[PDB]
Coordinates of C-alpha atoms and ligand atoms in Angstrom, one line a residue:
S11 CA -268.7 -103.0 -94.3
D12 CA -266.4 -105.4 -92.6
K13 CA -265.8 -103.0 -89.7
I14 CA -269.4 -101.7 -89.3
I15 CA -271.3 -103.2 -86.4
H16 CA -274.9 -104.2 -87.0
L17 CA -277.0 -103.4 -83.9
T18 CA -280.5 -104.4 -82.9
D19 CA -282.9 -103.5 -80.0
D20 CA -281.9 -106.9 -78.5
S21 CA -278.1 -106.3 -78.5
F22 CA -277.9 -102.6 -77.9
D23 CA -277.6 -102.9 -74.1
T24 CA -274.6 -105.2 -74.4
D25 CA -272.7 -104.1 -77.5
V26 CA -273.0 -100.4 -76.7
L27 CA -273.9 -99.8 -73.0
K28 CA -271.4 -102.4 -71.6
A29 CA -268.6 -101.3 -73.8
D30 CA -265.7 -99.1 -72.7
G31 CA -264.3 -96.9 -75.5
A32 CA -265.8 -94.7 -78.1
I33 CA -268.7 -95.9 -80.4
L34 CA -270.4 -93.9 -83.1
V35 CA -274.0 -95.0 -83.7
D36 CA -275.7 -94.1 -87.0
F37 CA -279.5 -94.2 -86.8
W38 CA -281.0 -94.7 -90.3
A39 CA -283.8 -96.1 -92.4
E40 CA -284.2 -97.0 -96.1
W41 CA -286.5 -94.0 -96.8
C42 CA -284.0 -91.5 -95.5
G43 CA -282.1 -89.7 -98.3
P44 CA -279.3 -88.0 -96.3
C45 CA -278.7 -91.2 -94.5
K46 CA -277.5 -92.8 -97.7
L47 CA -274.9 -90.1 -98.1
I48 CA -273.5 -90.7 -94.6
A49 CA -273.5 -94.4 -95.2
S50 CA -271.3 -94.1 -98.3
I51 CA -268.4 -92.6 -96.2
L52 CA -268.5 -94.8 -93.1
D53 CA -266.2 -97.5 -94.5
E54 CA -263.5 -94.9 -95.0
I55 CA -264.2 -93.5 -91.5
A56 CA -264.0 -96.9 -89.8
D57 CA -260.6 -97.5 -91.4
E58 CA -259.1 -94.1 -90.6
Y59 CA -260.2 -94.1 -86.9
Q60 CA -259.8 -97.8 -86.1
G61 CA -258.1 -98.3 -82.8
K62 CA -259.9 -95.3 -81.3
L63 CA -263.4 -95.6 -82.6
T64 CA -266.0 -98.3 -83.4
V65 CA -268.7 -97.5 -86.0
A66 CA -272.2 -99.0 -85.7
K67 CA -275.5 -98.7 -87.5
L68 CA -279.1 -99.2 -86.3
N69 CA -282.1 -99.3 -88.6
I70 CA -285.0 -97.6 -86.7
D71 CA -287.8 -99.3 -88.8
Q72 CA -286.6 -102.8 -87.9
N73 CA -285.6 -101.7 -84.4
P74 CA -288.0 -99.0 -83.1
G75 CA -287.2 -99.3 -79.4
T76 CA -283.8 -97.7 -79.0
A77 CA -284.1 -94.2 -80.5
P78 CA -286.9 -93.0 -78.1
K79 CA -284.7 -93.8 -75.1
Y80 CA -282.6 -90.9 -76.2
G81 CA -285.3 -88.6 -77.4
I82 CA -284.2 -88.7 -81.1
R83 CA -286.6 -86.6 -83.2
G84 CA -285.5 -87.4 -86.7
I85 CA -282.8 -89.0 -88.9
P86 CA -280.1 -88.9 -89.7
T87 CA -278.9 -88.5 -86.1
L88 CA -275.4 -89.6 -85.0
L89 CA -274.7 -90.3 -81.3
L90 CA -271.2 -90.7 -79.9
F91 CA -271.1 -93.0 -76.8
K92 CA -268.1 -93.0 -74.4
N93 CA -268.2 -95.9 -71.9
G94 CA -272.0 -96.2 -72.1
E95 CA -272.9 -92.6 -72.0
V96 CA -273.9 -90.1 -74.7
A97 CA -270.9 -87.7 -75.0
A98 CA -271.8 -86.0 -78.3
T99 CA -274.7 -85.5 -80.7
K100 CA -275.0 -84.5 -84.3
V101 CA -278.2 -84.2 -86.4
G102 CA -278.8 -83.8 -90.1
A103 CA -276.8 -84.3 -93.3
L104 CA -273.0 -83.7 -93.2
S105 CA -270.1 -83.9 -95.6
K106 CA -267.1 -86.1 -95.0
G107 CA -265.1 -83.1 -93.8
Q108 CA -267.7 -82.0 -91.3
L109 CA -268.0 -85.5 -89.9
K110 CA -264.2 -85.7 -89.5
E111 CA -264.3 -82.3 -87.7
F112 CA -267.0 -83.5 -85.4
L113 CA -265.0 -86.6 -84.5
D114 CA -261.6 -84.9 -84.0
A115 CA -263.2 -82.4 -81.6
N116 CA -264.8 -85.1 -79.5
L117 CA -262.2 -87.9 -79.5
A118 CA -258.9 -88.6 -77.7
Ligands
CU214 CU1 -265.9 -103.3 -94.9

């Protein structure tokens, strides 16, 4: 977890919106089962894509203000921001392979 950014409603506008590059935001909560699966593979993802991707997590129970700004309906939901704009969206549980496919198709 040394490369995973911990976001809050208070730092989202700065850490995400004012950043140029690609940032993957993982919206999760402790009660969400599928979220735990995705969480166990992020450290590997952050290492493999470092230099071209930053991985961040935001707990919606502790920080309830951000998700509604993007109309998120449920979790897990992964949003890929590029220079402060949503460039890709993925909802539901996914295997390591599917996540890697989602990233390769959307990054550069
Ligand atoms: Cu780490």
